[PDB]
């Protein structure tokens, strides 16, 4: 009777999750380093704090620090289950980072590896990390960054008599760059594991102090008057993405919104506007050039970081060469600063452009989110998302048409995705938020709005493509890199791309065609033509009179 | 219908046994040492082997060794289950011990801690250690001891012109004493985890090479012409105990017995005879005195060892002070040899006598075993167990009656247990093995056999105890220490000894009475009187004529 059911396993090995977590801590290794993180902390002592102790976490004066970490780990594996083992490790390593940090004489070499270790502790099982531990860890990392106040506050230009006669040493600068970058990466990690918790419990994380501390550190990261560290700009805007994305996806959204003032957003969005108007150019990413106009990714902080692999990791060998690896020490191993740099490839510049274009996609994506949060009018959905976004759309169509077509870079498609995205940031601002699009603000960008819509409606002529034979000749000219990409995807990495049955490559010779149309800046997609049509031609606001509009239509045909 | 059964657990956490084994390795620590064993091996490098590698177990030249152990442990936790994780660790640490050992220039400081670590690997789950790993580990430890050939071969007495002008250093001597003692302790551990396996599979362990290698190392340990190390004598006779005990407790006992020659036993038993005739005296245990007559436990090897806690562990601080603990080194930290020794307590001598009396109980216990193996006659159950055991019985009755009664030492009872045990080693030799008790050999000990039986049959008079009132006055005189022992057991450590219902202390005032009788050397137990009666009076052999026997009976009464 009912011999159908799936039979259980009588000897289920539910794996010991705290043992897996112990092992993932013990063989945690940051990319490019020779030793493991615990095996670097076995080579570190702290010789000014004569006796560290918080809660049976004694470190002696000359003892290895990672000796005490692995003693804590073994001692608290036996005792605590996973959700208590996590926050025990978080508060103990936090207190150690704290009193190594607030000290006048002591070197801070243990701090980057303890922050990376703390990040490995947080993100291991995101369901197991209770969010009061996340709250305390978030507040600790924010005031840890305000301890390292000066790393994100180097001035733009130095003295003319700033003589570079100095030992030119990089090891302390490398340490506090690692501290700041791993700290911002840990803030992103805290908020994305908090994003994974059930959606009724976000108020256990958020209070006044969370948002004040992130307001300080966000004004610190997306700087105006100091040299930008791009590593922290990525993470500092991804935090704002996680914030808007959970304001959209929680039920009691009022408590976050009533907890946030208007000044928080109108200090955030102006720095996002100042970030969206910066330039992304391959030939001078890694250059040091004019300030606050080129997102540029400095040579002196080029490593991966804890989440995403952002440069080519040129400073990853120096993390391993920051310690002597056969010795127990406190001061750093000497890294010369001008030995790095040695000319082979500008492909590195192309992929750093790829990251910076995804950064601008991120910025106008959180614009797209907080249109949807503040669907009703406020201080912040206030018409300057016509000004800055239409300036952006118009210039990234203009120098696309003037500069990028036929330049065999991988980053063209994404760069003509940005415009294709930000039109929609125009469009739902036009259709669904016209009540705040003030008449004085629309005429600040009446040039650029109308011209940017015109460069979409020019594609309805379409005397270019119309067939298949010369379009593939065009994509030999503009889009050979994506032919290499799709052949490498077809021969290695895609399950659908073998034994192609003459219906799956007739979709390829539809979508490569519409891709190379959308790159060649004639024949965009029909839907974006409609969205650009129903802004200019629609009578919600008179952009053009009827005798000024057909002066634009005669410059296509019509 | 049948709502009686015990309900199972739907969320059984079967604990990950290889995680527990990983943790027991990582926090293994030998008694008296400051650091853990892995944490000592983090402080050791090997700077003459420029690159060690066996099977992806690479050690660099200046790397920490315990770094490579913990790398192997983490790497093989993921992959191997427990019975393969064990023998992977055994053969890898064996190859490391091997090529550190056979090297002319390299210091051998890693070897004691790797042997102690190997012992922790073996005995963790004895059911999980497959016995071919035990066979290979046994053969490795036996030829490891024959590598350290010279530790158990220092001569008895030195030159008169052996000037003690020399740096007088102990650290290398401490290392190879630790190597030999932990190796013999590991041989005992191999054979007792092999003793715990199911009794059909002993032939997977034993072959010719096992018994030849233990024959060599057993002739090496129980020495004749060299200075004895008592640490290895305990373990080397406990191995012979495990061998005789499993020959008694296996089904196919012939294969062990056909694998053992007669020369193996007749070289074993003569060294056991030479061990049974040594003296145990408290005032010169820890002295250095005349050779091969006093079991004496030298000052220069007084530590615990891996199984049993044998001395007071005076050299346990020097194991921790053998390394610099803030440094990665290869040569030992300098230990002065004549700093030890500083007079407070001869209680240490009493408990070392307690161990040596248990050692003699062990020797005549394996005599009792191999009477039962070779119930039929052989080369070895051959009548000299009348000579040596009756010499032993007669002298340990004689100087008990002359020296020990009223000397308030804890070791009296056990010393009058030995005689009470070895009478039975006489008795079943008398009753059940008379076919080989040759007539010429009985008259070699006809003095001592008859006198030792006479000192039991003198107790049938019993005009001493006969009541309760003066027997407790006698045990104030001879046995006050056991009153302290039973009061400490009664007030702290025994569940039955509270609310004593006047039937459980009326057994105490039976058994303290028979204990103090058996100590006072008048009124032994009635059963041992019968065993001594049915040897002398019985007519299996005419020890006495009928007119010589009543000359012995008139010296009691009769």
Q: CB neighbours of A177 closer than 8 A, spacing ≥ 6?
A: A151, A229, A231, A300, A301
DSSP assignment of B313-333 equals -TTSHHHHTTS-SSS-BSSPP
Residues A423, A429: Cα–Cα separation, whole Å: 10
Partner-chain contact A14 B15, CB within 8 Å: no
DSSP, collapsed to helix, strand or coil, labels residue A193 as helix
Taking an 8 Å cut-off on Cβ atoms, the answer to whether A70 and B26 are in contact is yes
Phi, psi of B59 (to 5 degrees): -115, 135
Angle, CA of B257, B263 and B265, to the nearest 5° = 60
Contact of A519 with A417, CB cutoff 8 Å: no
Q: 10 Å Cβ neighbour count for A552?
A: 17
Which has the closest alpha carbon to A412: A484, A278, A520? Answer: A520
Q: What is the DSSP letter of B7?
A: P
Largest separation between any pair of C-alpha atoms in chain B: 93
DSSP of B366-427, one letter per residue?
Answer: HHHHHHHHT-S--SSSSSHHHHHHHHHHHHHHHHIIIIITTS--TTHHHHHHHHHHHHHHHH
Give the chain B residue nearest A72 (alpha carbons).
B27
The Cα B503–Cα B511 span in angstroms is 13
Q: Which two tokens stand for residue A149?
A: 């106040």
C-alpha A135/C-alpha A140 separation (Å) is 9
Helix pair A171-195, A208-221: axis angle to 10 deg = 140
Query: With contacts defined as CB-CB under 8 Å, which chain B residues touch A26?
Result: 70, 74
* Look-up of token digits 């190859």: B95
Checking B256-260 for CB contacts under 8 A at 24+ apart, the result is B256/B202, B256/B206, B257/B373, B259/B206, B259/B207, B259/B208, B259/B211, B260/B211
**Cα A291 to Cα A129: distance, rounded to the nearest angstrom:** 41
| Angstrom distance (rounded) from CA A355 to CA A241 | 16
Q: Which member of A26, A62, A67 has the closest CB to residue B74?
A: A26
- Give the count of Cβ contacts less than 8 A between chain A and B: 48
**Residue B16 burial (10 A CB sphere; 0-12, 13-18, 19+):** buried
Token pair 């219902």 in the structure block, residue: B501
- Residue B413, both tokens: 């009872």
Q: What is the DSSP letter of A315?
A: T
Asked whether the beta carbons of B556 and B460 are under 8 A apart, the reply is yes
Rounded to whole angstroms, the Cα distance separating A234 from A189 reads 13
Record the tokens describing residue A450, joined without a space. Answer: 């109308």
CA atoms within 13 A on the CB side of B238: 22
Dihedral sign computed on CA atoms, order B220, B223, B227, B229: positive
Beta strands in A235-335 (DSSP E): none
Q: DSSP readout, B32-72?
A: T-SS-HHHHHTTB--SSSS-B-SSS--B-SSS-HHHHHHHH
A374: left (phi over 0), alpha (psi -120 to 50) or beta: beta
DSSP sequence for B453-519: HHHHHGGGS--S-SSSHHHHHHHHHH-HHHHHHHHHIIIII-SSSSS--SSSSTTHHHHHHHHHHHH
* Contact assignment for B14 to A13 by CB distance below 8 Å: yes
- CB burial string B59-69: b at 16+ within 10 A, e below: bbeebbbbbbb
Consecutive H or E run containing A327: none
Residue linked to tokens 């040492």: B33
Residue with tokens 């039962």: B372
Residues of B in CB contact (< 8 Å) with A are 11-16, 19, 22-23, 26-27, 39, 42, 45, 62-64, 67, 70, 74, 77-78, 326-328
Which residue is closest to B47 within chain A, CA to CA? A326
Q: Is A393 exposed, middle or buried (0-12, 13-18, 19+ CB in 10 A)?
A: buried
| Length of chain A measured in residues | 558
Let me know: does A84 contact A130? Beta carbons within 8 Å: no
Q: Which residue of chain B has the CA closest to A45? A: B326
User: How is residue A295 written in tokens?
Assistant: 């997102």
Rounded-to-integer distance, Cα B423 and Cα B535, Å: 10
Closest CB from B12, B13, B328 relative to A327: B328
Tokens of B302: 């007084």
Shortest Cα–Cα distance, A9 to chain B (Å): 11
| CA atoms of A383 and A265, how far apart (whole Å) | 15
Closest CA to A444 of A373, A376, A383: A383
C-alpha to C-alpha distance for B357 and B421, rounded to whole angstroms: 12
- Measured between beta carbons, which residues in chain A are less than 8 angstroms from residue B327? 328
Contact B18, B82 (CB under 8 A): yes
Rounded distance between C-alpha atoms, residue A52 and residue A68, angstroms? 10
- Name which of A418, A423, A388, A396 is nearest A275 in CA terms: A388
Say if CB B114 and CB B67 are below 8 A apart. Answer: no
Contact A389, A447 (CB under 8 A): no
What is the distance between the alpha carbons of residues B265 and B371, in angstroms, rounded to a whole number?
12
Choose among A424, A355, A378, A408: nearest CA to A519: A408
Mark out the alpha helices in A338-411 (DSSP H runs). 347-373, 384-399
Nearest CA in chain A to B63: A326
As beta bridge partners, residue A52 has A59
B74 contacts A27? CB cut-off 8 A: yes
Handedness of CA B136, B138, B141, B146 (dihedral sign): negative
Residue in A closest to B70 by C-alpha: A26
Residue among A267, A263, A296, A262 at smallest CA distance from A279: A296
Instruction: Please give the structure tokens belonging to residue A46.
Output: 């702290």
CA distance B323 to chain A (A): 14
CA angle at residue B82 from B78 to B87, to 5 degrees? 105
Helix (H) or strand (E) holding B81: none
- Other beta carbons within 10 angstroms of residue A353's beta carbon come to 22
Helix (H, G, I), strand (E, B) or coil at A210: helix
Using DSSP, state whether B221 is helix, strand or coil: helix
State how far the Cα of A405 lies from the Cα of A398, in Å rounded to an integer. Answer: 11
Tell me the CB-side half-sphere exposure of residue A13, using CA atoms within 13 A. 7
The DSSP bridge partners found for residue B226 are: B155
Contact B183, B144 (CB under 8 A): yes
Q: Are B224 and B174 in contact (CB under 8 A)?
A: no
A26–B70 CB contact, under 8 Å: yes
Radius of gyration over alpha carbons of chain B, in Å?
27
Chain A hits for B42, Cβ within 8 Å? 42, 64, 67
Torsion of Cα atoms, B115 then B121 then B125 then B128, to 10°: -110
Give the C-alpha separation, B306 to B181, whole Å.
Answer: 8
- Secondary structure (3-state) at B341: coil
The distance in angstroms from the start CA to the end CA of chain A is: 77
Q: Please say whether the beta carbons of A276 and A360 come within 8 A.
A: yes
The CA distance from A75 to A186, in Å, is: 25
Q: How big is the CA angle at B69 (ends B64 and B70), to the nearest 5 degrees?
A: 95
- Residue B454 near residue B399 (C-beta atoms within 8 A): no
Q: Considering only CB atoms, which chain B residues are within 8 Å of A19?
A: 16, 19, 22
CA R_g for chain A = 27
Reading the block at residue A434, the tokens are 């016209």
Residue A555 to residue A109: CA distance in whole angstroms: 64
Maximum separation of any 2 CA atoms in chain A, in Å: 93
Name every residue in A having a CB less than 8 A away from some CB of B: 11-16, 19, 22-23, 26-27, 39, 42, 45, 62-64, 67, 70, 74, 77-78, 326-328
Nearest to A326 by CA among B40, B43, B71, B331: B43
Angle (CA) B211 B214 B220, round 5°:
145
Residues of A in contact with B326 (CB under 8 A): 45, 62-63, 328
Task: Tell me the β-bridge partners of B155.
Answer: B226
Question: Chain B closest CA to A74's CA: distance in Å?
Answer: 7
Cα torsion through B324, B325, B327, B330, rounded to 10: 60
**DSSP states of B164-176:** --S--B-HHHHHH
d(CA A77, CA B20): 10
**Cβ atoms of residues B387 and B444 within 8 Å:** yes
Contact residues, chain B, for A67 at CB < 8 Å = 39, 42
Nearest-neighbour CA in chain A from B7: distance (Å): 14
Closest CA to A483 of A515, A506, A507: A515
């Amino acid at each position: 009777l009912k011999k159908n059911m799936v039979p259980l396993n009588p000897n289920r090995i539910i794996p010991d999750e705290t043992s897996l977590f112990l092992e993932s801590i013990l063989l945690h290794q940051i990319i490019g380093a020779d030793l493991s993180t615990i095996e670097i902390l076995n080579r570190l002592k702290l010789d000014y704090i004569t006796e560290f102790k918080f809660k049976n976490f004694v470190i002696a004066k000359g003892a290895p620090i990672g000796k005490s970490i692995v003693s804590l780990l073994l001692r608290c594996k036996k005792t605590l289950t996973l959700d208590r083992f996590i926050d025990t490790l978080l508060e103990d390593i936090a207190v150690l980072i704290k009193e190594i940090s607030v000290h006048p004489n002591e070197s801070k070499l243990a701090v980057p590896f303890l922050v990376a270790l703390m990040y490995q502790i947080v993100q291991f099982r995101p369901s197991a990390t209770h969010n009061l531990a996340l709250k305390d860890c978030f507040l600790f990392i924010c005031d840890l960054i305000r301890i390292y106040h000066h790393v994100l506050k180097v001035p733009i230009h130095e003295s003319n008599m700033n003589l570079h006669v100095e030992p030119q040493i990089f090891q302390y600068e490398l340490i506090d760059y690692l501290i700041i970058s791993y700290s911002f990466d840990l803030l992103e990690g805290i908020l994305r594991v908090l994003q994974s918790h059930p959606k009724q419990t976000y108020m256990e994380f958020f209070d006044e102090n969370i948002l004040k501390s992130f307001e300080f550190v966000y004004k610190l990261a997306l700087t105006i008057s100091y040299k930008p560290m791009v590593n922290v700009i990525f993470s500092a805007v991804e935090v704002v993405n996680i914030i808007t994305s959970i304001i959209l996806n929680m039920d009691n959204s009022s408590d976050l919104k009533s907890l946030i003032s208007g000044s928080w957003w109108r200090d955030c969005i102006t720095r996002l506007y100042a970030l969206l108007e910066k330039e992304i150019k391959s030939g001078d990413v890694y250059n040091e050039n004019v300030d606050t106009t080129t997102l540029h990714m400095s040579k002196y902080h080029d490593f991966f970081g804890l989440i995403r692999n952002i440069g080519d990791n040129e400073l990853g060998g120096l993390i391993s060469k920051l310690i002597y690896t056969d010795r127990l020490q406190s001061v750093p191993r000497v890294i010369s600063k001008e030995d790095i740099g040695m000319f082979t490839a500008p492909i590195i510049g192309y992929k750093m452009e790829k990251w910076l274009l995804k950064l601008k996609d991120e910025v106008l994506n959180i614009f797209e989110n907080l249109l949807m949060i503040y669907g009703d009018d406020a201080t912040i959905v206030n018409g300057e998302m016509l000004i800055h976004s239409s300036k952006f759309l118009s210039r990234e169509q203009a120098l696309m048409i003037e500069r990028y077509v036929g330049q065999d870079s991988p980053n063209l498609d994404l760069r003509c995705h940005l415009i294709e995205h930000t039109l929609t940031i125009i469009y739902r601002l036009w259709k669904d938020h016209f009540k705040q699009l003030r008449e004085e603000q629309i005429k600040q960008v009446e040039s650029q709005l109308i011209m940017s819509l015109w460069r979409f409606l020019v594609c309805q002529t379409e005397t270019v493509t119309a067939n298949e034979r010369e379009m593939r000749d065009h994509r030999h000219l503009v889009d050979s890199l994506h032919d290499l990409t799709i052949k490498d995807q077809a021969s290695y990495y895609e399950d659908a791309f073998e034994d192609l049955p003459e219906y799956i490559e007739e979709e390829l010779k539809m979508q490569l065609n519409k891709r190379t149309g959308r790159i060649m800046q004639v024949k965009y997609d029909e839907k974006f033509q409609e969205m650009a049509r129903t802004i200019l031609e629609s009578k919600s606001f008179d952009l053009t009179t009827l005798e000024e509009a057909d002066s634009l239509y005669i410059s296509m045909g019509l």
